[PDB]
Amino acid sequence: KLPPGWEKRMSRXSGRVYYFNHITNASQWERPS
Numbered sequence: 124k125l126p127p128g129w130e131k132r133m134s135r136x137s138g139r140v141y142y143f144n145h146i147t148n149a150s151q152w153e154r155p156s
């Protein structure tokens with residue numbers, strides 16, 4: 124699936140899903156490869 128660190132999160136501002144990297148703090152809409 125996602126490289127290390129990447130996970131999906133629901134925005135706390137109306138629930139849109141983004142990809143977040145807990146290692147690097149990166150975030151993006153598109154799926155990381």
Ligand SMILES: [Cl-]
Pocket residue numbers: 127128129
């Ligand atoms: Cl992880």
Ligand SMILES: [Cl-]
Pocket residue numbers: 131132133134
């Ligand atoms: Cl979440």
Ligand SMILES: [Cl-]
Pocket residue numbers: 132133134135136
């Ligand atoms: Cl959030």
Ligand SMILES: [Cl-]
Pocket residue numbers: 134136137138139
């Ligand atoms: Cl949202």
